[PDB]
Paper text:
NAMPT functions as a homo-dimeric enzyme that catalyzes the rate limiting step in the primary salvage pathway for NAD synthesis, the transfer of a phosphoribosyl residue from 5-phosphoribosyl-1-pyrophosphate (PRPP) to nicotinamide (NAM) to produce nicotinamide mononucleotide (NMN). These structures consistently display a NAMPT homo-dimer with two essentially identical active sites at the dimer interface. Typical NAMPT inhibitors were found to occupy the portion of active site responsible for NAM binding and a tunnel-shaped cavity extending from the NAM binding site.
The crystal structures of NAMPT S165F/Y revealed a somewhat surprising conformational change in a small helical structural motif spans the sequence G383GGLLQ388. We designate this motif as “380GRS” to reflect its position in the primary sequence, and its glycine rich characteristic. The unwinding of the 380GRS in S165 mutants rendered the structure less compatible with the binding of PRPP. Our structural studies thus reveal that the S165 mutation modulates NAMPT activity by interfering with PRPP binding in an allosteric manner. Consistent with the structural observations, S165F/Y mutant NAMPT proteins required approximately 500 fold more PRPP compared to the wild-type protein and the other NAMPT mutants. Furthermore, xenografts derived from cells harboring the S165Y mutation in NAMPT are resistant to GNE-618 at doses that are efficacious in the parental line, suggesting that this is relevant in vivo.
Author numbering:
A (entry chain B): 8 to 42, 53 to 382, 388 to 486
B (entry chain A): 8 to 43, 53 to 382, 387 to 487
């Protein structure tokens, strides 16, 4: 079973011995430090609070386990048994910590306080930074939610330009990343962050995480459609690709179906198999049940443009009100190979240049890290001998790693923007009310958001 | 509770209707595909997945009903193969009718070789082989982490041996600091265990618990750490009191090694004036078994290491070892844990060598952008039986010959020169190439062969270490 006492960086076990003696308060904060990606979607802390931090997280058994493990790990006794026993005895294993945070789904410029953490009992001054490691992992859903919002902005721009509207934007970037992430847990978290922005997903795990920790009015937050993979085409044999295609589109004749078409020759498949041999089975399909042709190899832009040029000559194309070419409603394309934010941008611009509407295409979804948005957790205020002091790092060779000082608060500016106030200056009351809310206190979650509210908070300006 | 019926790519739910009718067998394989350098990979991690996710009664009535309910809403249609899963529940008590054969864990195998194969053991479950692709393919991660760290160890070994004349301490030269930097708790355990295949120093205890539960070591633990400061334990003392913080910390940990981050305000002042003057007397009195380890954590990683060494070299007694390289006294060492990937690791050790500093002096602290594409980890169907006829199948996209897959039943063999070769089209059966190196590790819900973490470490050793 999960043990919070074994869920921290090893050296943090030794930190209670390193703070100034008579320290009663340690106060720390998380930011996406300021140096593309000028604003971040704050998302994912609520999962962490609920799965790992709330309730009786300390037991006699868990304390003994940590004692035994650290004894071998450090080859010495350095584990703070007494401190954890205090929390067990005094608070029935609930963490005497208060966490304040911006609402989930909030879109906030870099360099602002997003959450703060402090101990609520003088005896547990060491606890604030013990849980740094776990809370810092929020960088992942934040960065994923953020990156996908940025992709949506690009898609929205180009769909609006080529079509005159945003219809179907939420299905334009489908999550196919399940097998490409590092773990099952990561699959659920990352997919949920994707679903903040889009509705189309092949990663089931996202749906369950959302239902358990956030909640939606609807039965599910995300949807998929039948689709082929290379094995369901190749199993038929190299000479029977046409047979595979006919069987699949016939099995899925009244729902949308995606069919990977590059097993052997994408261009032949589009022009001769779909565009000739099986054409009668495609033109007869309903607008609610299109064939979605999926190329999956080659240069992403060149392949997409050639696939469209091929289909344009085999199927009736219209020109929409904005002047852009549009395939018939029973025929679409999905490109899910090598689509990152850069390649996404190159494809939609390339399509636009060739007078193809973004209506025609969807994308399928990569190496995001903690340094991308500079997600960082730092101590900014401590009380020692009853005196509060503002603390910070400011390394000489890197001004960008300078941290914020003292008690922090988040405020609306007179122009309606965000500003973080340092050194407890929030208390001067010149900038109105703190925009952070208490989300966790003494083992309990004190404020939470539905996934529906999170989606509303994360909307694009163009959608509003 | 984890439901295997919900642990696949959505579209795979629909594949039982797409395979050719009268298909009784689907046979699929995993490789780190060769690309037209990471020329060899450490196979590691499948055993975790087999035990955590695949073995035993993984199908229940409630799990089938849960999946049916979820899929009805997810697809806005009834596409779920309830009958097929019911069959596994009734006929096999919910155990998966699958056989998996794999190269031993820890094995170091050149790119483009079969590493494991998967096939159904019951004709009715032809669809099941690729249902579990998604979960099996996630093995890319421990494979790639274990491989990347082995490659970093190769570089460390080269330079340590050149500048010192031995490999002493090699297993503690790259410490795992990546806990906060990975995507999840589960990833933390898996990634740290793959690090531990190569090294012994770690701050991610998650990896220790995974190894103990899934692999096992003779020793109490596979990995170790020492006390260390963070910016908070230094800055909490106040801007004017860094010296006080340093003195306090080295005195609290006077008899064990201790790492102390020293760049809170000014790394070069801290090294020259605080450690190298004000507190010098507390450092030069330390035991060889209890060095101070100075930790810079900002600035250009090579520039900073070199300047730190130059500073310390002038404040402390340096010797020249038998190879002609400079060596700090034994009570003083440095760890660089900012921005160290494989490229920067090479640049630092090479830069140190050029400035006549031994690698004995330094240790490093560490994925970053490790992905499935790095080693081209891929799972592909290569053989089916339809209407009782075996057919060899594959993909071969016109615009990318690098994505061509292998054909037929596969086997892995030793070449006459002692290398590896994958045999396709069932040609292993000709028995011209000795025994198949793949072993059955999973069959019908049971793990059939397991490896200790001790064996895996043995298998993954460097040639330089064997010599």
């Amino acid at each position: 079973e999960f043990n919070i006492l074994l869920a921290t960086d090893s050296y943090k076990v030794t930190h209670y011995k390193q703070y100034p003696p008579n320290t009663s308060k340690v106060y720390s904060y998380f930011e996406c430090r300021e140096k593309k990606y000028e604003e971040t979607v704050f998302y994912g802390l609520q999962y962490i609070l609920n799965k790992y931090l709330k309730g009786k997280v300390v037991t006699k058994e868990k304390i003994q386990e940590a004692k035994d493990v650290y004894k071998e790990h450090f080859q010495d006794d350095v584990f703070n048994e007494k401190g954890w026993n205090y929390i067990l005895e005094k608070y029935d294993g609930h963490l005497p910590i208060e966490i304040k945070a911006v609402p989930e789904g909030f879109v906030i410029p870099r360099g602002n306080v997003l959450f703060t953490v402090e101990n609520t009992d003088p005896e547990c001054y060491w606890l604030t930074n013990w849980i740094e490691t776990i809370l810092v992992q929020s960088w992942y859903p934040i960065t994923v939610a953020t990156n996908y919002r940025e992709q949506k902005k690009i898609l929205a721009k180009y769909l609006l330009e080529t079509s005159g509207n945003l219809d179907g934007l939420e299905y334009k970037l489908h999550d196919f990343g399940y097998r490409g992430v590092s773990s099952q847990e990561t699959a659920g978290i990352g997919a949920s962050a994707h679903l903040v922005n889009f509705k189309g997903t092949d990663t089931v795990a996202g749906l369950a995480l959302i239902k358990k920790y956030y909640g939606t009015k609807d039965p599910v937050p995300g949807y998929s459609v039948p689709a082929a993979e290379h094995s369901t085409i190749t199993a038929w044999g190299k000479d029977h690709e046409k047979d595979a295609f006919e069987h699949i589109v016939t099995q899925f004749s009244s729902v949308p179906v995606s069919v990977v078409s590059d097993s052997y020759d994408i261009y032949n498949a589009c022009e001769k198999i779909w565009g000739e041999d099986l054409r009668h089975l495609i033109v007869s399909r309903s607008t609610q049940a299109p064939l979605i042709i999926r190329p999956d190899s080659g240069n992403p832009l060149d392949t997409v443009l050639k696939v469209l040029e091929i289909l344009g000559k085999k199927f009736p194309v219209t020109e929409n009100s904005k002047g852009y070419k549009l395939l018939p409603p029973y025929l679409r394309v999905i490109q899910g190979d090598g689509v990152d934010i850069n390649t996404l941008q190159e494809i939609v611009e390339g399509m636009k240049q060739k007078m193809w509407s973004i209506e025609n295409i969807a994308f399928g979804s990569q190496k995001l890290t903690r340094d991308l948005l500079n997600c960082s957790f730092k101590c900014s205020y401590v009380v020692t001998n009853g005196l509060g002091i503002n603390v910070f790092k400011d390394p000489v060779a890197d001004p960008n790693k300078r941290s914020k000082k003292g008690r922090l608060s988040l405020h609306r500016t007179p122009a309606g923007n965000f500003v973080t106030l340092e050194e407890g200056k929030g208390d001067l009351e010149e900038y109105g009310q703190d925009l952070l809310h208490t989300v966790f206190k003494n083992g309990k979650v004190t404020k939470s958001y539905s996934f529906d509210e999170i989606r509303k908070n994360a909307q694009l300006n163009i959608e509003l």
